[PDB]
Amino acid sequence: QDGLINVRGGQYGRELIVHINGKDVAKYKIPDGSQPEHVNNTDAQWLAEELAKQMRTNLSDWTVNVGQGFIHVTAPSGQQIDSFTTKDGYADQLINPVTHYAQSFSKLPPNAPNGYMVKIVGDASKSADQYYVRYDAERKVWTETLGWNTEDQVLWETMPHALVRAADGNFDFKWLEWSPKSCGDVDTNPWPSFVGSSINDVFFFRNRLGFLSGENIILSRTAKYFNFYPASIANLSDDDPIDVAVST
Amino acid sequence: KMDTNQIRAVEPAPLTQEVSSVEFGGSSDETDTEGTEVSGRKGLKVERD
Amino acid sequence: KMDTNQIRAVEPAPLTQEVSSVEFGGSSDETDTEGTEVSGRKGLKVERD
Amino acid sequence: KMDTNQIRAVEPAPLTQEVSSVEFGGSSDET
Amino acid sequence: KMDTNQIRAVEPAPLTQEVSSVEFGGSSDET
Amino acid sequence: KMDTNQIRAVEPAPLTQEVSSVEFGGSSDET
Amino acid sequence: ADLSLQARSKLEEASAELTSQNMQKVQAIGSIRAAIGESMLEGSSMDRIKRVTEGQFIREANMVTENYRRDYQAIFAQQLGGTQSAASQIDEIY
Amino acid sequence: KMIAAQTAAGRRQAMEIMRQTNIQNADLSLQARSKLEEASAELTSQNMQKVQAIGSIRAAIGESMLEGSSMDRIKRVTEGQFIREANMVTENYRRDYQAIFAQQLGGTQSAASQIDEIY
Numbered sequence A: 001q002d003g004l005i006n007v008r009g010g011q012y013g014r015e016l017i018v019h020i021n022g023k024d025v026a027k028y029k030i031p032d033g034s035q036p037e038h039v040n041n042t043d044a045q046w047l048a049e050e051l052a053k054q055m056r057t058n059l060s061d062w063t064v065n066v067g068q069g070f071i072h073v074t075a076p077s078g079q080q081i082d083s084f085t086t087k088d089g090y091a092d093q094l095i096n097p098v099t100h101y102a103q104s105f106s107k108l109p110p111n112a113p114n115g116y117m118v119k120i121v122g123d124a125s126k127s128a129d130q131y132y133v134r135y136d137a138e139r140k141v142w143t144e145t146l147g148w149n150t151e152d153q154v155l156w157e158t159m160p161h162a163l164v165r166a167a168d169g170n171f172d173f174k175w176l177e178w179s180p181k182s183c184g185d186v187d188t189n190p191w192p193s194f195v196g197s198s199i200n201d202v203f204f205f206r207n208r209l210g211f212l213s214g215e216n217i218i219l220s221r222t223a224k225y226f227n228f229y230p231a232s233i234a235n236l237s238d239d240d241p242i243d244v245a246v247s248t
Numbered sequence B, C: 001k002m003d004t005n006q007i008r009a010v011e012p013a014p015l016t017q018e019v020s021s022v023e024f025g026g027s028s029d030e031t032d033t034e035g036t037e038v039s040g041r042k043g044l045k046v047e048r049d
Numbered sequence D, E, F: 001k002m003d004t005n006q007i008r009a010v011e012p013a014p015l016t017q018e019v020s021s022v023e024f025g026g027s028s029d030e031t
Numbered sequence G: 001a002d003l004s005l006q007a008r009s010k011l012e013e014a015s016a017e018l019t020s021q022n023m024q025k026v027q028a029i030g031s032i033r034a035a036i037g038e039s040m041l042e043g044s045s046m047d048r049i050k051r052v053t054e055g056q057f058i059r060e061a062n063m064v065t066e067n068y069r070r071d072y073q074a075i076f077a078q079q080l081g082g083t084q085s086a087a088s089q090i091d092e093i094y
Numbered sequence H: 001k002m003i004a005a006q007t008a009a010g011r012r013q014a015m016e017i018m019r020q021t022n023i024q025n026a027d028l029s030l031q032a033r034s035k036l037e038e039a040s041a042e043l044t045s046q047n048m049q050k051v052q053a054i055g056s057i058r059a060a061i062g063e064s065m066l067e068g069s070s071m072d073r074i075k076r077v078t079e080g081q082f083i084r085e086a087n088m089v090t091e092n093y094r095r096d097y098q099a100i101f102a103q104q105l106g107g108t109q110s111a112a113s114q115i116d117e118i119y
Helices: A036-041 A042-059 B005-007 C004-009 C040-044 D003-010 E002-008 F002-008 G002-039 G044-093 H003-063 H068-117
Strands: A004-007 A015-020 A023-030 A065-066 A070-074 A083-088 A118-119 A131-136 A141-144 A162-166 A172-175 A202-205 A208-212 A216-219 A244-246 B022-023
Touching: A015 A042, A023 A042, A036 A042, A036 H003, A042 A065, A065 A208, A118 B022, A202 B005, A208 D003, B005 D003, B005 F002, B005 H068, C004 G044, D003 G002, D003 G044, E002 H068, G002 G044, H003 H068
Parallel strands: A141 B022
Antiparallel strands: A004 A070, A015 A023, A015 A083, A065 A070, A118 A131, A131 A141, A162 A172, A202 A208, A208 A216, A216 A244
């Protein structure tokens, strides 16, 4: 539904074309650059504004806003994009479309809006590295987050509870608040493998909270007792929890 | 015929101080969230008043 | 005589995004084929209904 | 330690990015 | 010696500094 | 482990490819 | 036309590197496939470490393709720069 | 008539020299964006090693069963090492930008003086 357009500088005189649902939306040609007045036409910010104004006229509602170096397009919730491509009139590095599916983390917009989800699927064939990252605006950094349509939490009602001594001396019997999964989708970050079976036993192996499901051992992270999920889809941290189902 | 001072007055685009990058999970630690991030037996212990 | 607009209108050949290579056997794994690729005792086990 | 030994033998490369730039010749005007 | 072994595997990079300089062309005077 | 030890000593070279570019001179026209 | 042939050269240099990284990919992943099978632990964690290591090799191929892509962009621009320089100079002749 | 043609040649010569330095200036601006990407890709690669290394450190301190302020320090320091070199990558990009920003400016001033001299 949402898209972005990078802006890089235009290089003085190349036709810039945007395709929205097959329409040549917001076609614009930078001038040659002979007069000093044309020098202002090359900076990235002004290209974002000018392309947006033409996009406003061509598109019905399609609320479009421009950041420091990008162009954000939002569909009117009636129809989706369904085709998002741009022509630089040059080598590709003038304006390239940014959808929610990037091939590489290198091929990512620097600016982006406040919250923008990207699935980096390096190879379509392979489960591989299909991790999601999402932009953070307060600090210009992309932080990986789990998938959009996935659910991150267990019920906490069926998960084991704890009897906790309170500060005043009396005793509380609460459930344990675990950690929502925050790395990937259900296919790439599977469930802790006890979410369908009862928990047999509880133990503390070397600084890890341990559960025995039907057939497989489940151990949490070393530091975090209630966090049964790996930290990152890529570059496993060697602290992440272990889930092994005894072969035999 | 151009303008003499107009060329000089033009200046390049200003500096961008910070470069955006991917921050993989596990880098963030010891934040100010009330959620349990304190680890080990330190988190489980509660003081008596 | 040429046409100075015609030279400018000419543009180089467009970008080729992907480059061909060889996948030696063993790179492909865990596909959607019904053929038995699941390995170990997991594949041999069958659930009860 | 079969898992730890063999994974240490993986060793993928960094592959830092490398870029070049465009050039324009210019022209000399006669009369 | 788990702490000593792992810290030895940390290996951050020094990344010494590098700087370049400006250039001015000059002009040729006619009449 | 005779087979594993010796094959580790094989070490063939990768020898990545290298290609150059062609050149043309051009001419200056008189009259 | 030289740079156009040079683009084709850089494509096949990158292609040769892709196969070279690929034949090490199958040896390294194939080596892991053995130990996972021999570990007799099985489970979700074992599928992860193969998945993560396989993810590293795919990132390797993506960057090689990316480096060629911007290699093409630089010489695509360089070809175009010569064409515009020729167009302006030809125009001044007349 | 002849003098008018020479002046018409003079301004058109100024047009091309200004156009040439504009193409070069726009070239370096795209090159600045490229160096930002190279620095950005390095920061992600350094971030990839950071979480593995820090994640590895967290594993042994947890299993060390010792805890305390000193063990919080060793993680704190080795995390600091990754940050300080991450800052230097950003600093090196700034040094690169300052040079090309200046180099773009030098071309504009060089073009300005030559154009003003023609007429």
